[PDB]
Amino acid sequence: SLLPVPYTEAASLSTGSTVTIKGRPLACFLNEPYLQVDFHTEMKEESDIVFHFQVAFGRRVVMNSREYGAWKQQVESKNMPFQDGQEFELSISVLPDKYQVMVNGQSSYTFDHRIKPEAVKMVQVWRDISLTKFNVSYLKR
Amino acid sequence: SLLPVPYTEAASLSTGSTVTIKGRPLACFLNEPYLQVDFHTEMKEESDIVFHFQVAFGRRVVMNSREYGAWKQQVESKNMPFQDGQEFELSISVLPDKYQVMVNGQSSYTFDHRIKPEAVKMVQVWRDISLTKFNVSYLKR
């Protein structure tokens, strides 16, 4: 749709920051589309990833970090609030101890900080979605 | 780039048909981009897939068919002629007994027919690539 995918935005995060993403899968769930959201330590795509959030629509979600080039301990969830063929609203909130992921207003995943969120310099949203809204909030000290 | 992705084209295939695809991955191999090519029995995206060809760039290729809604026997290859960061040329030729997949001119995969190629009505090319060329040949009887 309107925002380019892959979508890259320079970003800073700290406690109280919220990343809001509105989009739609590009395929029916039977065809197994994916969504990926990566919080990077540099603007370069090969940089470390403080928070990796990857949705296999209709199947599972995997979360991880990539530290000094290497993937760490994978967290796998079978929670699937995303609905086949529907637009979704994703909210990722930076809490003192973890990221909290809301899907269509419902708390759906959390991921404890492995690297301080202040290390983030960039957010990338990609794979099989169209994007109509992307926002990072900057209201807190 | 120039062709829209996901890319869908109505198509017919028989012995001697060649499907030629030129494109580039949208991410470095470290970020594990994908490429998928599906030969469908109808224009509808949920239709059966006579040949499913899915490249996890830098990792593996999986091939399968989806018959009456259900995936059949997966074939997994670790052959990886695709080069990190490079444009690729993919050629899929319909032989009497199998599809033959050429990558940058080199024979790289084959897949025996499970459903007659005459059942194909549509080709879809999608996942994390840009596309500059797509052609189906129609020169043979």
- B7 CA: distance to closest CA in chain A (Å): 11
User: Peptide bond preceding B6: is omega within 30 degrees of 0, i.e. cis?
Assistant: yes
DSSP 3-state of A69: coil
Method in brief: X-ray
Q: Resolution of the deposited coordinates, in angstroms?
A: 1.7
H helix and E strand count, chain A: 0, 12
Give the Cα separation of A136 and A125 in Å (integer): 13
Give the Cα separation of A81 and A114 in Å (integer): 25
Report the greatest alpha carbon distance in chain B.
Answer: 44
Contacts of A41 in chain B (CB under 8 A): none
- Closest of A84, A97, A77 to residue A16, by C-alpha: A97
Give the Cα separation of B95 and B14 in Å (integer): 8
Contacts of A46 in chain B (CB under 8 A): 28, 30-31
- A51 CA: distance to closest CA in chain B (Å): 13
Give the Cα separation of A55 and A88 in Å (integer): 12
Contact criterion met (CB < 8 Å) for A45 and B31: yes
**Number of other CB atoms surrounding residue B79 within 10 Å:** 12
User: Peptide bond preceding A6: is omega within 30 degrees of 0, i.e. cis?
Assistant: yes
Say how far residue B40 (Cα) sits from the centre of its chain: 11
- Say which CATH architecture domain B1-141 belongs to: Sandwich (2.60)
Contact criterion met (CB < 8 Å) for B46 and A30: yes
**Is the minimum CB–CB distance between B74 and chain A shorter than 8 Å?**
no
